[PDB]
Amino acid sequence: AYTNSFTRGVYYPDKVFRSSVLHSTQDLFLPFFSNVTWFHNPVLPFNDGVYFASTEKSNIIRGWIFGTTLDSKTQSLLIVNNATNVVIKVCEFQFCNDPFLGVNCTFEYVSFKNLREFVFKNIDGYFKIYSKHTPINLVRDLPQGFSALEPLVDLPIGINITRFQTLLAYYVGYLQPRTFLLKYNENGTITDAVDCALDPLSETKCTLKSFTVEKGIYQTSNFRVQPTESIVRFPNITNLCPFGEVFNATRFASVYAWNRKRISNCVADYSVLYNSASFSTFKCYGVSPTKLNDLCFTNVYADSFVIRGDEVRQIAPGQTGKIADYNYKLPDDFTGCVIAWNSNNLDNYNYLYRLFRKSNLKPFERDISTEIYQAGEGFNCYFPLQSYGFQPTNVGYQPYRVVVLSFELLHAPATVCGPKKSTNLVKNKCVNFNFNGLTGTGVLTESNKKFLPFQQFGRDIADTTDAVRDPQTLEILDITPCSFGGVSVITPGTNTSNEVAVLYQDVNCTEVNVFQTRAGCLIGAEHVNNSYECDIPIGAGICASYQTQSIIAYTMSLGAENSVAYSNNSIAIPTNFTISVTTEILPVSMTKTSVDCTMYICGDSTECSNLLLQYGSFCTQLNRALTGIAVEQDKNTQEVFAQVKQIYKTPPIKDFGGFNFSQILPDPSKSKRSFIEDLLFNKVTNGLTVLPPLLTDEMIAQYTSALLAGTITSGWTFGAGAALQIPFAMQMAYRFNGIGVTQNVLYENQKLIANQFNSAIGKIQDSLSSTASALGKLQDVVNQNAQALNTLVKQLSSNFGAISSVLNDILSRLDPPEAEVQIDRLITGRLQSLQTYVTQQLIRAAEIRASANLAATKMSECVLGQSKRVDFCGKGYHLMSFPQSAPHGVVFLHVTYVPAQEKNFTTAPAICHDGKAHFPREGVFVSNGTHWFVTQRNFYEPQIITTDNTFVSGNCDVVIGIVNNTVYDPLQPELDS
Amino acid sequence: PVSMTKTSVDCTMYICGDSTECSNLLLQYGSFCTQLNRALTGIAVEQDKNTQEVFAQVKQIYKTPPIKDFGGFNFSQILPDPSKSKRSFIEDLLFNKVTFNGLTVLPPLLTDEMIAQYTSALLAGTITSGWTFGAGAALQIPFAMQMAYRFNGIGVTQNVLYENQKLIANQFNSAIGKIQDSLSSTASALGKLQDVVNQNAQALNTLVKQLSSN
Amino acid sequence: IRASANLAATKMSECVLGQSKRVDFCGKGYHLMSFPQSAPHGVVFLHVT
Amino acid sequence: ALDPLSETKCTLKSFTVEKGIYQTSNFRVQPTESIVRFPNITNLCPFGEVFNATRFASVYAWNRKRISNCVADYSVLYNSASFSTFKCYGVSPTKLN
Ligand SMILES: *[C@@H]1O[C@H](CO)[C@@H](O[C@@H]2O[C@H](CO)[C@@H](O)[C@H](O)[C@H]2NC(C)=O)[C@H](O)[C@H]1NC(C)=O
Ligand SMILES: *[C@@H]1O[C@H](CO)[C@@H](O[C@@H]2O[C@H](CO)[C@@H](O)[C@H](O)[C@H]2NC(C)=O)[C@H](O)[C@H]1NC(C)=O
Ligand SMILES: *[C@@H]1O[C@H](CO)[C@@H](O[C@@H]2O[C@H](CO)[C@@H](O)[C@H](O)[C@H]2NC(C)=O)[C@H](O)[C@H]1NC(C)=O
Ligand SMILES: *[C@@H]1O[C@H](CO)[C@@H](O[C@@H]2O[C@H](CO)[C@@H](O)[C@H](O)[C@H]2NC(C)=O)[C@H](O)[C@H]1NC(C)=O
Ligand SMILES: *[C@@H]1O[C@H](CO)[C@@H](O)[C@H](O)[C@H]1NC(C)=O
Ligand SMILES: *[C@@H]1O[C@H](CO)[C@@H](O)[C@H](O)[C@H]1NC(C)=O
Ligand SMILES: *[C@@H]1O[C@H](CO)[C@@H](O)[C@H](O)[C@H]1NC(C)=O
Numbered sequence A: 001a002y003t004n005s006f007t008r009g010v011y012y013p014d015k016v017f018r019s020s021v022l023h024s025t026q027d028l029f030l031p032f033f034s035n036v037t038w039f040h041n042p043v044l045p046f047n048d049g050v051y052f053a054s055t056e057k058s059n060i061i062r063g064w065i066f067g068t069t070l071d072s073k074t075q076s077l078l079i080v081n082n083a084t085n086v087v088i089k090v091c092e093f094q095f096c097n098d099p100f101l102g103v104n105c106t107f108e109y110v111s112f113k114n115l116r117e118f119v120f121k122n123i124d125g126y127f128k129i130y131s132k133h134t135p136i137n138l139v140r141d142l143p144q145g146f147s148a149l150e151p152l153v154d155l156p157i158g159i160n161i162t163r164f165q166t167l168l169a170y171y172v173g174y175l176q177p178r179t180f181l182l183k184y185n186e187n188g189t190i191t192d193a194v195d196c197a198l199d200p201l202s203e204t205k206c207t208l209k210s211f212t213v214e215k216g217i218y219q220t221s222n223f224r225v226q227p228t229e230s231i232v233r234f235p236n237i238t239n240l241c242p243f244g245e246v247f248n249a250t251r252f253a254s255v256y257a258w259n260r261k262r263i264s265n266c267v268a269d270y271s272v273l274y275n276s277a278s279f280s281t282f283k284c285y286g287v288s289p290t291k292l293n294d295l296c297f298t299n300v301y302a303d304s305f306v307i308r309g310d311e312v313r314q315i316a317p318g319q320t321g322k323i324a325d326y327n328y329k330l331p332d333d334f335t336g337c338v339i340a341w342n343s344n345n346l347d348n349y350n351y352l353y354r355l356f357r358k359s360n361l362k363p364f365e366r367d368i369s370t371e372i373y374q375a376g377e378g379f380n381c382y383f384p385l386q387s388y389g390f391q392p393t394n395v396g397y398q399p400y401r402v403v404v405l406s407f408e409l410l411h412a413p414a415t416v417c418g419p420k421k422s423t424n425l426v427k428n429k430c431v432n433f434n435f436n437g438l439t440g441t442g443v444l445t446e447s448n449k450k451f452l453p454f455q456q457f458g459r460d461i462a463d464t465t466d467a468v469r470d471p472q473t474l475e476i477l478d479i480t481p482c483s484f485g486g487v488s489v490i491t492p493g494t495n496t497s498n499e500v501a502v503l504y505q506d507v508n509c510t511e512v513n514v515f516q517t518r519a520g521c522l523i524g525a526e527h528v529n530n531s532y533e534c535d536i537p538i539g540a541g542i543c544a545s546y547q548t549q550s551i552i553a554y555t556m557s558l559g560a561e562n563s564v565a566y567s568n569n570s571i572a573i574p575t576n577f578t579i580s581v582t583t584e585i586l587p588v589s590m591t592k593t594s595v596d597c598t599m600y601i602c603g604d605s606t607e608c609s610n611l612l613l614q615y616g617s618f619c620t621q622l623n624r625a626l627t628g629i630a631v632e633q634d635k636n637t638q639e640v641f642a643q644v645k646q647i648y649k650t651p652p653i654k655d656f657g658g659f660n661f662s663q664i665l666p667d668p669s670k671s672k673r674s675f676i677e678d679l680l681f682n683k684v685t686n687g688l689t690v691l692p693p694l695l696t697d698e699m700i701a702q703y704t705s706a707l708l709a710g711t712i713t714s715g716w717t718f719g720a721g722a723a724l725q726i727p728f729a730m731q732m733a734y735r736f737n738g739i740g741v742t743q744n745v746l747y748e749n750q751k752l753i754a755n756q757f758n759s760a761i762g763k764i765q766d767s768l769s770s771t772a773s774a775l776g777k778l779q780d781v782v783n784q785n786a787q788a789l790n791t792l793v794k795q796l797s798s799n800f801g802a803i804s805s806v807l808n809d810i811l812s813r814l815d816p817p818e819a820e821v822q823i824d825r826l827i828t829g830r831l832q833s834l835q836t837y838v839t840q841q842l843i844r845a846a847e848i849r850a851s852a853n854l855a856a857t858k859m860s861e862c863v864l865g866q867s868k869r870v871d872f873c874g875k876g877y878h879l880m881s882f883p884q885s886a887p888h889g890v891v892f893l894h895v896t897y898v899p900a901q902e903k904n905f906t907t908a909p910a911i912c913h914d915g916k917a918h919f920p921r922e923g924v925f926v927s928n929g930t931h932w933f934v935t936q937r938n939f940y941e942p943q944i945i946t947t948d949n950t951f952v953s954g955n956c957d958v959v960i961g962i963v964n965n966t967v968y969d970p971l972q973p974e975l976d977s
Numbered sequence B: 001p002v003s004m005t006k007t008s009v010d011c012t013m014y015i016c017g018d019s020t021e022c023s024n025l026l027l028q029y030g031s032f033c034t035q036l037n038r039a040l041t042g043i044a045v046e047q048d049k050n051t052q053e054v055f056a057q058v059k060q061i062y063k064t065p066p067i068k069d070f071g072g073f074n075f076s077q078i079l080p081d082p083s084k085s086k087r088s089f090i091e092d093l094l095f096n097k098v099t100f101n102g103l104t105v106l107p108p109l110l111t112d113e114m115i116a117q118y119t120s121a122l123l124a125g126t127i128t129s130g131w132t133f134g135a136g137a138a139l140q141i142p143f144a145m146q147m148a149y150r151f152n153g154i155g156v157t158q159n160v161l162y163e164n165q166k167l168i169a170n171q172f173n174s175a176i177g178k179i180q181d182s183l184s185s186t187a188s189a190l191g192k193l194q195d196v197v198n199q200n201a202q203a204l205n206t207l208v209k210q211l212s213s214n
Numbered sequence C: 001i002r003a004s005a006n007l008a009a010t011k012m013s014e015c016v017l018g019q020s021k022r023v024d025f026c027g028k029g030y031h032l033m034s035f036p037q038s039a040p041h042g043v044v045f046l047h048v049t
Numbered sequence D: 001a002l003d004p005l006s007e008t009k010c011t012l013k014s015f016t017v018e019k020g021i022y023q024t025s026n027f028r029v030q031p032t033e034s035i036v037r038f039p040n041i042t043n044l045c046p047f048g049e050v051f052n053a054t055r056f057a058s059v060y061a062w063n064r065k066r067i068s069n070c071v072a073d074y075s076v077l078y079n080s081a082s083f084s085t086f087k088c089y090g091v092s093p094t095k096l097n
C-alpha cells in the first residue's frame, strides 16, 4: 500500500543547537517520496531501522515487541502504561505465547484528531525514543507539513533489533543510510529538509548546501556502471596439493640444512589449515591469514626447519640474531606467512646451529660447512656447529618448530590456486572478473594481439594489466573498464521551476525523452534543432535553456549573424552616439589574515610545541610567507590608491558644467562616501586574525574621495604634476580630441551630452542597485577567502586519519607514547592543510596582484590620465574613468564613446581636381550620391573639401580608385571673390 | 600559448578509485581531495574563461562576400577554405604540422570547428571594416583606405602608399607565400605551443606513473 | 598561461581589434595590423610591420 | 628575555635591527584558573542499599543486581570506619573515582 511522504521521518541527529545555519549529516533516515506500509500484528523486519507513524483514536495500541527473535529467547522490549504508571524495559519477563498483560531484568525503568509519530531505535546500547503529537483534520493519508521527532529520553538497554510487531491503522517505513541536509531556523528548530538521494535537483541542492540553488551546471557525483555479474577465471589445475606432506609431515630437517621444495601444479586449500588450532602463531605479512583461500600464486617455495623458542621473533623480515646472522636469514621485504606450532609436544641431540662465520648470508641462501672455525685445521679451531639442548626428558627452553610459506608473487604461468570455481565467460559486460587473482571491472573482448608463447599478460603505461591470457582456453582478451564520469545536473533555477535535466559526460545512451550528443547522453532535455544564445554551457556547443514551459537543448548561437556589406566603394559613418559606461569591477586586495602554528594547530599545548620544534623552520617560514602576503596586500593598496601625494578637495560650488556628480561626489552625512559608494557598501556584504588594513574603511574612503575629486576637478594635470584646474567643458573637449573628434561638435552637443551623462549615471544607479552581478568578482573573492578560512577551520574538526580531532580529548585519553604518534599524524595532516591553504593564498595573492597591477595601470593611465588603448578602459573609444571605493576592490566608471546612428555613403580612396591627387589631413572622403564631402572618422561632420583639410600631391594616373572632384581652398575665394 | 587541455581529474578516481574502503579512509582526511577537485574544476572553468576572453570578444559572426576584392591582397591562405572544416590553408597546415584512469579530458566549450568560426568572424570583420567592427558598428572601408590610415598612424603619408600600391600588394602576397613556405618547412615556429602541450602531457604521464610508484 | 593569455587578449583587442602604437608590442618595427589564425589550444599572429 | 629591543634582536638573528615593525611572539592572556561543570548529583544510585546496606545474603545465594544510572561515591568507603578493612586489588584505591 504505497503513500506520499513529503518530509515525514526526520529526527534530530544530536543535541547541538544551531541558529540560521544549514547542516548536512548522514544517518538512517526515511527517504523522501518513499511509499511506506499502510495497515488497518505482523512481524516486520528492522533491517536498518523503521520509521513509525501511528494514528491512535482510542489508545488501542499499548506497546511493541522489539528484537531479533522476539519469542522470549533473548531480551525483548516491552512498554506498557496501565493508565497510572508506565512500565518500560527490555526485561526478560515471563511472556505468554503471544506476549500481553492481563486487562535477567536489565533495565529498571518501572515507573483523526492527533497524529502520533514514533521512531524506536537503539544505537551503541542507548535506546533513542523519538515522538511527536500534533493535531490534524484529515483521514486520507499523511498531511502536508514538516515535523522533527525529538528524542525525549535516552535508555541504556543494548539489544539487537531486526523484527518487531504492533500490540493493539498505522504506518511503518524503513530507514536507510542516506545523506540528508537539515535547515535550522533562528529559534533553533528544523523547518525543512532535502534528501539528496531522491532526484538530481535534490542532489544539486545537497552539493550546493542551499535550499535555493542558482541556475547553472554543477557536478554532483560520478556515474559508474555497476557489475551485473561475477566472472571467475582460473586454470584447470584441479590437482590437489600435498600440503599434508609439510604439515602432517613426520620428518623435518634442521635449520643448518633447511630443505626447500618448489610447489607447482597444485590446489592451495588453506581452509582447514587456517581453521586448525595447530598453529600457535600465524603471522602473515605479505598476505592475510583469512584471505588465503582466494589468492592464487604462480610459483611458491616451502621451507622446513627447526628453531628455538626465544628466536620466534627472528623469523621475520628485517630481523637479526644467531640464526638470522650466520645460519639462515629472511628477506627484508619477504612476502608470505610464518607458521610456528606449539611443538613442545611434537618436537634428541640432533638439531644444529652455527656459531661463527664470515658475515651474513643472503636471504634463502643455503650454506653448508662443517669446519674452518673463526679463530679457535685440527687446532683449537674445530667443528663450528653445536647441537640444541633438547631431550625427550626435557616453556621458553622447549622446542618450537617453524614452517615458512615463502609466497613468490612473481609474474608467471599460474600453478597453485585456491579452491575456487570457474564461471562462464561473458563479453561486453562490466562484471567483477577474477583472472588468476587479478580483479576489477571491465569488458572482456576478443583481442587481436599476438602474444608470444612465453609472454603471459600485457600492460599499459599505467602499469595496469591491459590484456590477460585466459588460462583455461588460450586466448587473449583486452581489459577495458566501461563508461564512467562525473554527473552534471542542469537546473534552470528553483526560483522559476523544479524540472531539471541530466548530462552524462562522454557516455553513449546505450549504457544508461533521451538525446545523445557529442558530450555524451543527455537525459531530461528535449533536443531542439533551433539555435539560441545560451546561458548554461553543456559541452561542444550544446546548451540548455528554459523556454515555453520546458527545458530546451540546442546548439549555441555563435552570435547575432550579421553579414557585413563589405565592398569596394561603400562605407558607413556614425551620425549619433551614446555615452554608455560599464561598471568594471576588479578586486585589488584580500583580507589580511595571519595564522600562528600553535594557535591554529593545537593552541596552548606544550607537547605540541615540543613535537613541532623538531619540524625545523616550517613555522617561521609559514609566518614569514603570511606576513609577506599581508604586506603585499598593503603594498597593492598603496600602489592602487596612494598614487597622488596631495589630498585635493572640491570647491564649495558644484557647477560641474551641468554634469550631476552628486551620485559620485562624497557625502559627509555618515564615511565621506558617494551615493554609489554607499550603495556598494550596502550591496556588498582560532589563531586567525583579520589584521586591519593600513588604510581602514574611513581612510580608504577619504583617499578614494580625494582621487575622484582631484580627477573630476583637474582632469589629468593633478597626476601629471601640480594640479592645474581646468573647466570640465574643456576637459571633455580634450578627451574628445584624444579619440579623433573635434571640440566644435561637443560645444554644439553640450547640453544633450550633459543630459545623456546624467541619464547614464541614473541608469548605472538603477543597475548597481538592482542587479548585483557587476560586483560578482568581488563577491567571488570574498566567498573564496571565507571558504578557505572555513575549510582551514573545519580541518581542525577533521581527524586526518587520527583517532579524533579534539587534541584536548586526545591528550587526556591517550598515554604519552601513542599520543606522540597520534599528535604526529595530527601535525602532518594539519600542516599539510595549512600548507595547501598558504600555497593557495600565495596563488590568489599572485592573481590578485596581477589584477591589482592591471587596475593600478588602468587607473594611473585612465583616471590620472586618459587611456588610448582599444578596449582597455571599456568597449569603444575611451574618454575618462571615475573610481569608486569598494570593499577589497575598486569600481570604475568607464566613460566611452559608442556610435549609434549610421548612413550609407559613397566613398573613394582619393580625389583628383586638376591632375593632382588630394588627401585629407584627418578625416574620410565620402559622398551622399550627388555632392562630395569630407568628415571625421568617428563622427559624421560633413564639410566642404578645403585645402585647410586636404592638400595637392602627385598625379592621378597611378593611383587606383581615385575619382574626379572639385576642391575648395579657403584662400581661393579670398583671392578671386 | 592560449589554452590548456582541460584535464579534469576526480580525486578518488585518481588516487584509489573504485574502492569503498579506501574512499572511506580518504574521507577521514577532511576535504583535501574535495577542495582539490573544486580547485581543479576551477582551473578547468578558468581555462574556458580564458578561451572566451581570448576568442569570443565579439558578439557577431561576420562573413566576407563571394568576391575576394581586397585590393589585390590574396587572403585565401588566411581566409577559411569552405571546400573542406571551415579552416584556412595556413590554419589547416598548423593543424597538420602539429598533431582512461579517472583523468578525463573534458571537451572544450569551444570545439575546433567553433574556434575556426570565431577566428573566421574576427579576421573577416578585421579585413572588411578596419577597427570599426571592434569600436562600434561594423563600418566597411576600402582596404586601400585602411592601409592609408595605418600608414598615417605611424607617421608616413599615404601618397607613397598610393604611388607604390602595386609593389606593396606584391610584397604582401610574396610575404604570405614566404610564410606558407616557413610554416610548412620549419615547424619550429610552433615550438612554444609544442613545449606547452608536451609539459602538459609530461605532467599527465608523471601523474599516471605515480600510480606505478610504490 | 593566464598571464600570457591576458597578454594575448590585450594584444588581440589592441592589434587585431585595433592598432597598437607601442613599439615592439606587435612585433619588431612600426605596427600596422595583425591577423589571427586558429591553433590547437593556441593562436598565431601575422604582424604586418 | 630582557627587553622588547632584545626580543627583536633575538628573533631576527642579528645584533643590528633596522627600522620597521616585527612580530616576535604571541601575547596570550593565560587562563587564571579552571572551572568544571557537570550535571547535578541527582539520579544518584541506590548505593546506600549496597554501601550503607543493612542486610546481605549467603555465599551460595550470591545474586547479581544490575543497577543503572549510578553515581559512585567512593570517598565514604575509602574513609569508612565502620568497615575495618579496605584491601583493594584491581586498581589504586585513591583513584577509584
Ligand atoms: C592430518 O592428520 C590427521 C591425523 O590423521 C588427520 O585427522 C583425522 O582426520 C580425518 C579427516 O576427517 C578423520 O577421518 C580421522 O578420523 C582423523 N584421525 C583421528 C585419529 O581421529 C587430518 O585430517 C590430516 N590433515 C589435516 C589437514 O590436518
Ligand atoms: C541621438 O539619439 C538620441 C536618443 O537618446 C536622440 O534623443 C532623443 O530625441 C528625440 C527627438 O526625436 C526625443 O523624442 C527623445 O526623447 C530623445 N531622447 C531622450 C532620451 O530624451 C537624439 O535626438 C539623437 N540625435 C539626433 C541628432 O537625432
Ligand atoms: C542629481 O540627481 C539627483 C537624483 O538622484 C537629484 O536629486 C533629487 O532632487 C529632487 C529635487 O529636489 C528631489 O525631488 C528628489 O527627491 C532628489 N532625489 C532623491 C533620490 O532624493 C539632484 O537634484 C540632481 N542634481 C543636479 C545638480 O542635477
Ligand atoms: C546630398 O547632400 C546635398 C547637400 O545638402 C543635398 O542637397 C540639398 O537639397 C536641398 C533640397 O531640400 C536643397 O535645398 C539644397 O540646396 C541642396 N544642397 C546643395 C548643396 O545643393 C542633396 O539633396 C543630398 N542628396 C540626397 C539624395 O539626399
Ligand atoms: C546480538 O547479536 C550478537 C551476535 O553475535 C549476539 O552475540 C548477542 O547475544 C545478541 N544480543 C542479545 C541480547 O542476545
Ligand atoms: C569592386 O567590386 C565591384 C563588384 O562588381 C566592381 O564592380 C568594382 O569595379 C570594384 N571596385 C573597383 C575600384 O574596381
Ligand atoms: C546600407 O546598404 C546595405 C546593403 O544594401 C543595407 O543592408 C544597409 O541596411 C544599409 N544601411 C542603412 C542604414 O540602411
Ligand SMILES: *[C@@H]1O[C@H](CO)[C@@H](O)[C@H](O)[C@H]1NC(C)=O
Binding pocket: B068, B072, B073, B074
Ligand atoms: C592569388 O594568387 C594566385 C596565384 O596562383 C592568383 O591566381 C590569384 O588571382 C590571386 N588572387 C587574387 C584575388 O588575385
Ligand SMILES: *[C@@H]1O[C@H](CO)[C@@H](O)[C@H](O)[C@H]1NC(C)=O
Binding pocket: D052, D073, D076
Ligand atoms: C554511609 O553511612 C555513614 C555513617 O552514617 C555516613 O557517614 C556516610 O555519609 C554514608 N554514606 C553516604 C554516601 O552518605
